[PDB]
Amino acid sequence: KIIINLFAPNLPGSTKEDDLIQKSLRDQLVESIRNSIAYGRNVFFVDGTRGAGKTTFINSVVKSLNSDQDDVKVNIKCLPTIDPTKLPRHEPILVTVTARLNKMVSDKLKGYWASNDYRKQKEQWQNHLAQLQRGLHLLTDKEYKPEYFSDALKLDAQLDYSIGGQDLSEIFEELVKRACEILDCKAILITFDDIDTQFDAGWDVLESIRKFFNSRKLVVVATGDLRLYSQLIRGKQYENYSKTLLEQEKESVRLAERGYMVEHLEQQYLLKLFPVQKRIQLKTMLQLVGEKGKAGKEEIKVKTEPGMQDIDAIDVRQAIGDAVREGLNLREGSDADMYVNELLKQPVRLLMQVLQDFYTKKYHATSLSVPNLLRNALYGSMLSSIYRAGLNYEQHRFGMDSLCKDIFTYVKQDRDFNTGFYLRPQSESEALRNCSIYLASQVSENCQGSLSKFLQMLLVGCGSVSIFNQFVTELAEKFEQLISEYVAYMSVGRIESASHWANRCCAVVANSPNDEKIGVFLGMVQLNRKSRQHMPGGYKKFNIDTENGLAKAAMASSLSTVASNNLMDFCSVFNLIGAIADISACRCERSAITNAFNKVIAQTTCIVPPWSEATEFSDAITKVEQWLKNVNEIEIGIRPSALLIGKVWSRFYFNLNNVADQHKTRLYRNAEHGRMASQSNAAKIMRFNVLAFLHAVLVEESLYHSVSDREYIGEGLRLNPVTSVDEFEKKIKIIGEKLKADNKTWKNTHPLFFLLISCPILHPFIFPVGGINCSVKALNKETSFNKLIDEIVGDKLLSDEEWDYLTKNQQIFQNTITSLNSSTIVGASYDKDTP
Amino acid sequence: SACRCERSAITNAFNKVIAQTTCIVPPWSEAFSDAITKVEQWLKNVNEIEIGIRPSALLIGKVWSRFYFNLNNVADQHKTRLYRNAEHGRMASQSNAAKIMRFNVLAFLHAVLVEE
Numbered sequence: 001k002i003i004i005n006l007f008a009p010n011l012p013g014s015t016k017e018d019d020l021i022q023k024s025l026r027d028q029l030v031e032s033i034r035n036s037i038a039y040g041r042n043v044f045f046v047d048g049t050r051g052a053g054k055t056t057f058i059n060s061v062v063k064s065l066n067s068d069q070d071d072v073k074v075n076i077k078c079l080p081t082i083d084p085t086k087l088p089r090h091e092p093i094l095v096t097v098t099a100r101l102n103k104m105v106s107d108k109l110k111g112y113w114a115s116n117d118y119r120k121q122k123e124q125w126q127n128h129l130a131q132l133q134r135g136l137h138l139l140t141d142k143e144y145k146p147e148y149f150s151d152a153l154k155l156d157a158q159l160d161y162s163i164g165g166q167d168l169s170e171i172f173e174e175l176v177k178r179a180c181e182i183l184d185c186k187a188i189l190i191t192f193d194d195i196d197t198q199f200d201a202g203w204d205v206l207e208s209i210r211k212f213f214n215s216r217k218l219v220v221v222a223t224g225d226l227r228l229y230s231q232l233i234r235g236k237q238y239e240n241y242s243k244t245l246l247e248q249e250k251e252s253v254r255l256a257e258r259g260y261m262v263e264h265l266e267q268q269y270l271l272k273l274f275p276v277q278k279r280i281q282l283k284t285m286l287q288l289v290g291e292k293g294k295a296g297k298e299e300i301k302v303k304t305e306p307g308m309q310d311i312d313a314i315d316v317r318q319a320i321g322d323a324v325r326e327g328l329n330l331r332e333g334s335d336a337d338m339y340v341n342e343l344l345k346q347p348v349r350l351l352m353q354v355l356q357d358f359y360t361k362k363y364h365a366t367s368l369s370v371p372n373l374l375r376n377a378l379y380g381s382m383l384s385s386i387y388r389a390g391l392n393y394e395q396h397r398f399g400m401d402s403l404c405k406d407i408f409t410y411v412k413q414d415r416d417f418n419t420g421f422y423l424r425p426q427s428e429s430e431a432l433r434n435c436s437i438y439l440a441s442q443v444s445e446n447c448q449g450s451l452s453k454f455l456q457m458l459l460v461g462c463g464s465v466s467i468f469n470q471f472v473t474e475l476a477e478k479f480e481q482l483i484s485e486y487v488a489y490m491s492v493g494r495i496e497s498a499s500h501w502a503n504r505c506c507a508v509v510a511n512s513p514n515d516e517k518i519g520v521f522l523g524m525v526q527l528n529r530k531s532r533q534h535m536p537g538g539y540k541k542f543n544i545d546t547e548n549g550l551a552k553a554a555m556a557s558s559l560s561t562v563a564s565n566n567l568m569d570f571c572s573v574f575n576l577i578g579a580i581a582d583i584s585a586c587r588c589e590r591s592a593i594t595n596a597f598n599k600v601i602a603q604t605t606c607i608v609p610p611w612s613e614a615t616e617f618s619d620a621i622t623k624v625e626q627w628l629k630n631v632n633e634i635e636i637g638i639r640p641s642a643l644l645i646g647k648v649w650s651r652f653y654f655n656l657n658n659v660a661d662q663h664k665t666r667l668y669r670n671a672e673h674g675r676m677a678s679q680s681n682a683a684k685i686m687r688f689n690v691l692a693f694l695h696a697v698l699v700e701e702s703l704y705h706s707v708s709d710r711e712y713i714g715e716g717l718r719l720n721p722v723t724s725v726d727e728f729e730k731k732i733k734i735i736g737e738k739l740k741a742d743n744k745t746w747k748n749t750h751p752l753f754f755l756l757i758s759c760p761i762l763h764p765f766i767f768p769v770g771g772i773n774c775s776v777k778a779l780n781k782e783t784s785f786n787k788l789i790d791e792i793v794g795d796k797l798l799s800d801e802e803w804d805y806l807t808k809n810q811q812i813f814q815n816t817i818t819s820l821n822s823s824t825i826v827g828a829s830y831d832k833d834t835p
Numbered sequence: 836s837a838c839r840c841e842r843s844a845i846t847n848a849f850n851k852v853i854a855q856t857t858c859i860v861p862p863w864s865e866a867f868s869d870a871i872t873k874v875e876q877w878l879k880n881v882n883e884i885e886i887g888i889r890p891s892a893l894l895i896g897k898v899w900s901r902f903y904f905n906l907n908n909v910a911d912q913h914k915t916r917l918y919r920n921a922e923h924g925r926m927a928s929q930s931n932a933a934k935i936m937r938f939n940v941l942a943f944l945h946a947v948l949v950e951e
């Protein structure tokens with residue numbers, strides 16, 4: 001039963017019983033210490049990294065040994081713990097030990113009453129101390145005076161030392177023996193604190209232990225890190241090599257053999273001092289409480305509130321679980337517990353300061369933004385790792401712009417361009433591992449409570465590194481110059497708008513001239529700006545004026561042109577998504593919504609990246625204004641994570657790869673008004689580009705969104721819709737009834753998909769006139785698809801007569817695209833027809 | 836091979852291994868309801884048998900070595916046996932994609948079998 005009170009100071013000095021994390025080792029060491037005496041140098045080493053609690057451990061060992069020392073068969077007196085870092089820089093350790101030993105002895109003489117025995121054993125003690133003072137210069141001398149030879153040849157004493165000469169260890173050995181007689185103890189414990197704070201001063205501890213602490217009446221307990229003593233020992237065996245030899249034999253053959261010798265003298269210097277059978281490894285908090293399935297060797301509980309009852313105290317893994325899950329907006333499972341495990345493997349001081357800072361402000365805040373509490377808690381603890389890894393550190397500049405830059409500068413060092421945006425604690429280095437949980441808190445804090453910041457992190461944050469894992473990585477110091485150019489061109493960290501990112505993102509996927517020269521790309525299709533001959537069928541140069549209402553608005557938000565030797569023109573889904581990320585940010589006023597469609601269309605000049613060789617429109621605004629009304633009351637309960645945004649991009653990116661190549665072929669002569677799956681056109685590619693985003697959001701919303709604990713897709717193969725709709729239709733059908741079963745609505749369980757499926761900007765792209773897979777029986781799926789969508793959003797996207805025109809083989813369309821199918825894709829050969 | 840052999844978790848874990856996994860090229864590049872049921876008793880046997888598994892470092896290394904070399908021969912001898920007609924056929928002189936992957940799987944079973 002171990003309970004840690006977070007509102008207590010929780011310091012190594014101010015830690016009483018009943019909260020010792022190391023209670024199994026404290027008892028195990030003490031009995032093993034007593035066993036050694038009850039049965040030669042006797043040194044116990046308590047291993048452990050920095051912040052493990054080594055000072056707190058020995059502090060408990062002395063407390064558990066000084067109690068009932070005379071009430072047990074083997075009496076062991078303990079000196080106060082010696083801290084090698086806090087001692088005077090030049091004070092010998094033997095001086096410190098003797099000074100602390102003299103105080104213990106003198107205090108015992110003042111407890112005696114028989115003056116005959118008091119005076120008999122005080123003359124001996126003063127004689128031994130005076131003899132130690134006489135020979136103390138042997139340590140603090142830079143030369144050997146010839147007149148000291150008389151001291152070695154003096155025998156004017158009754159000691160009758162075994163070996164001749166003024167051996168200081170011999171003088172100290174009987175000094176300890178005299179002290180044991182006075183204190184009436186069978187041994188004396190010399191506890192040495194760790195040297196981790198300043199480890200160059202721990203050499204005197206090592207040399208003193210092996211020289212003067214060899215007696216059977218001395219028990220030495222020294223803690224620290226063997227990884228740190230090894231560097232101290234190795235650097236001192238190198239000082240035994242003459243400087244001239246090192247300078248004259250700098251070549252590898254003899255240099256390597258010397259290094260083999262030093263590591264082979266270091267190895268046995270540790271084995272001589274701290275024997276393996278006596279070392280004790282301090283267990284980190286993960287090894288105590290254990291995992292969910294593995295039995296917890298101990299039971300650690302945390303008092304997360306002031307005045308909390310002992311029964312009320314909650315388990316530490318649950319306490320970390322609450323902070324990690326709510327702080328990162330993350331749901332119970334492998335991903336949430338992967339962060340919790342990493343926080344447990346942290347040094348105890350670092351972990352106990354994350355919890356202390358998080359739960360102190362959490363309680364104080366109520367007297368909420370839990371992700372903000374964890375962001376500040378992790379910022380302070382992982383600050384040394386943030387500085388090392390080069391992440392943003394100023395707190396007045398925290399925001400979306402200063403976060404997407406951090407995600408790019410993190411995966412660049414992590415080298416995980418495929419899954420780095422997940423921000424999982426997987427990096428081998430501890431600095432990048434520490435930043436991963438801090439960055440995850442940053443993403444779960446900024447994007448929380450707003451849909452606009454979710455899409456900016458999706459495109460600018462997660463996307464920018466994927467648009468680097470391809471289309472920029474083939475060009476690769478040159479790599480650091482490529483990074484410098486790429487982030488300056490795309491202006492990540494200072495983006496003007498999400499749409500502005502998409503237009504630059506259009507060029508990089510365009511300034512990489514793909515094979516077959518077809519102007520069909522990942523999530524973007526090129527369209528001709530000029531008219532020529534040789535165009536069969538109804539294919540024609542794209543004209544924006546053909547579309548009406550939302551149809552004109554939807555393309556205007558999607559069209560993006562880049563200035564080059566010739567003005568390329570593109571229709572991307574990133575521009576469509578970036579437009580949504582811009583409308584959501586602004587207010588519900590009509591004036592601001594109008595500018596969103598008109599931020600890029602006719603006032604931007606997207607020069608190619610340097611790494612290249614060369615009214616009814618008011619009705620459209622009304623629908624967007626109505627949708628923005630929904631966003632401002634639904635997005636307040638959104639809980640996006642760094643995992644969800646990373647996952648949603650991953651599926652959305654994978655689909656855009658499938659639809660890119662699976663439609664690079666089906667661009668045949670009769671593809672206009674495509675009705676079979678073997679014919680595709682600009683209305684087909686863009687329909688599944690948009691439907692890819694609506695699916696990636698849909699499938700991994702229920703999978704990973706923290707608002708709904710349960711899973712509503714159920715168990716099955718989560719195939720994604722490419723050139724088809726049944727894959728999307730299968731999942732959207734089966735989700736609907738489960739919420740009715742659980743008495744939950746579509747908006748309070750999948751707020752992200754509900755908002756994006758009800759966005760009028762992408763509504764014309766869901767059912768383009770050109771893009772409809774009205775097969776003999778697949779049209780029933782789309783008929784169900786339209787019915788499901790019309791019920792999710794609450795409004796009929798297309799009227800009964802409007803739907804019949806798309807399926808059955810004039811009409812004006814104010815809600816669906818019209819001229820996209822007739823558009824001519826650059827680099828497409830319109831000579832081969834569908835067979 | 837997961838823990839607790841939970842009929843739902845085994846189903847949940849089975850859908851992960853069959854889900855399509857897409858990955859990008861490395862930077863150093865120049866370019867079933869009754870199916871889950873049959874898995875249940877397999878984990879019933881695994882949890883009551885794997886306790887006795889005593890895999891050495893040499894065992895794991897050696898089994899791979901036979902496993903690594905066999906797939907070299909399979910990818911080399913069948914590298915030219917993709918003829919025009921009847922690769923499924925009747926004899927071993929011709930090879931198809933269903934027997935390149937048959938001997939690749941059989942190589943793993945053999946390498947485990949022979950050197951265990």
Ligand SMILES: Nc1ncnc2c1ncn2[C@@H]1O[C@H](COP(=O)(O)OP(=O)(O)OP(=O)(O)O)[C@@H](O)[C@H]1O
Pocket residue numbers: 004010011012015019020021022049050051052053054055056057193194196197348349352
């Ligand atoms: N038994 C314990 N109970 C409560 N908190 C503990 C305990 N052990 C360690 N801690 C926490 O971990 C921190 C580290 O303690 P400690 O000073 O012993 O570590 P150290 O870094 O190994 O030692 P040093 O201060 O000598 O460098 C403490 O300040 C405290 O916050």
